[PDB]
Amino acid sequence: KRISNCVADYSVLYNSASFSTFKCYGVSPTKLNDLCFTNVYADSFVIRGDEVRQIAPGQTGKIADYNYKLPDDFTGCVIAWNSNNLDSKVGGNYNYLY
C-alpha cells in the first residue's frame, strides 16, 4: 500500500489497546508524528507465533531470509496482533502459504 497526499495521525492507531506486540524499529508514533514524512508504505502479511521473533533488523531464520529481508537501516514500525477468530476455521485452514 502507498500513502500519498493524505494527512492523518498515528494516535488512533495506538490507543486501540488490542495489539499484542508493537515493534517500531524507527521512531515513536508521536516522534514520527511531530515531524513531516514524504511517503509511508504498508506491507501486510500473516505469520505464525514463533516467527514474530525473527522479524527484526539483524536476525536470521527461515522466514526473515527467504520471504522478507530486513535491512540494517530499517526505520519502520511493526504492528502485530491476534485475530485468530476470523482467519482460522475448524477442519484445517490451509489458505495461507509461505
Binding site: Y25, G26, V27, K31, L32, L35, F37, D72, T75
Partner: protein
C-alpha cells in the same frame, strides 16, 4: 600574481572541503543528523550520531 593568489585559493578550497565534509555519512545511514533522529529513536540511533 601567484604568491598572493595561492593563499586565498587554498583557504577558500579548504573552507569548501569543510562544507563538503557535512555532506558525507561517515559510515552512517544518513548525512544530516535530523533525519536519523526523526526516523529512529534516540536510544537506538546513538551509534550513528556518535
Amino acid at each position: 600574481l601567484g604568491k598572493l593568489q595561492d593563499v586565498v585559493n587554498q583557504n577558500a578550497q579548504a573552507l569548501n572541503t569543510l562544507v563538503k565534509q557535512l555532506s558525507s555519512n561517515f559510515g552512517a545511514i544518513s548525512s544530516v543528523l535530523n533525519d536519523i533522529l526523526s526516523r529512529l529513536d534516540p536510544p537506538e540511533a546513538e551509534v550513528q550520531i556518535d
